[PDB]
């Protein structure tokens with residue numbers, strides 16, 4: 001339903017593959033994160049769902065991540 | 069001697 | 082150094098055109114969404130950028146009084162590219178010494194002045210605020226808790242890399258590098274001027290850069306001579322420059338100069354950010370010269386995208402309550 005840029009979709013896929021494959025002593029899961037495996041799982045689902053983002057509709061001029 | 073981070077410098081010769 | 086810096090400043094061979102000359106009005110989030118901040122940018126005036134800077138005649142002694150005489154600052158010895166430290170009063174003494182009485186050539190490119198009186202005098206381009214991972218991704222109550230104005234890591238509550246003051250005497254040179262963590266840079270010439278050599282982060286050029294780093298001949302091989310296309314460009318007083326992730330650059334200072342600038346990660350060139358991080362890993366760069374809390378930040382990025390899009394939080398309950406309190410302010 002939201003449209004991400006291909007810049008973001010490709011970058012989030014790189015980032016999830018990167019963080020998932022770091023061993024425990026290099027993963028650096030920070031203090032605020034609850035269950036990082038469930039996070040990795042949710043990101044993969046979301047990337048599948050957003051894979052058909054439309055490139056023109058992604059150009060909203062406002063970032064998807066902003067504070068309320 | 070506190071450790072620092074975010075120091076901008078290229079590598080030494 | 083065995084290469085001739087004067088010939089690198091005089092030759093016409095670094096004639097690539099990689100920089101886009103833009104008006105500030107046009108540097109907005111839609112521009113970043115469309116182009117991925119892949120091109121170096123120069124803003125010959127500040128109209129429309131939303132920047133703020135100190136008085137036009139601000140001096141190094143003024144910077145000193147704002148950050149403290151006793152603040153330790155990292156300094157580069159230009160001849161060796163090695164680091165040393167002194168206090169800001171000692172640096173100011175050096176900078177105020179006539180040119181012919183200075184024994185050595187020193188540069189400061191690493192004074193991060195957040196959480197000092199200087200911080201509210203300088204604001205970077207508004208668009209950077211909308212995309213920087215620090216401002217948009219790191220838990221806000223942790224960033225707001227920072228008290229320490231130095232870059233001591235034990236007191237650092239977020240990646241403290243947003244606002245730096247560069248003070249460079251005539252003759253300063255900073256050899257080719259890529260900024261830490263594949264950060265993008267904004268750079269405003271408050272007084273003076275700078276000369277940059279720019280090399281694009283193609284796979285082949287990033288392989289050359291890493292091999293040059295591993296060879297340890299940086300003083301012998303001017304890296305812009307090793308690549309197919311390099312651009313040397315002059316930045317004049319009042320210009321603002323934005324360097325994209327990954328770009329390999331060197332910088333020469335033709336006149337005493339004061340710059341305000343800073344670093345940021347963002348969501349539109351994460352593959353390059355990750356590529357640069359891994360070069361630093363392979364080349365054994367000491368942590369002090371790296372982006373603080375880099376993978377911690379990357380975890381918070383994943384959590385923000387999932388929350389913002391799906392309303393599913395992966396922060397602890399306590400962190401969620403800290404955030405909700407700040408939403409009600």
Ligand SMILES: O=C(O)CNC(=O)C(=O)O
Pocket residue numbers: 188190247249253254255260266268275330332333342
């Ligand atoms: O200004 C200098 O001497 C060096 N500056 C940089 O490398 C930079 O701002 O990214």
Ligand code: NI
Pocket residue numbers: 258259260330
């Ligand atoms: Ni740099």
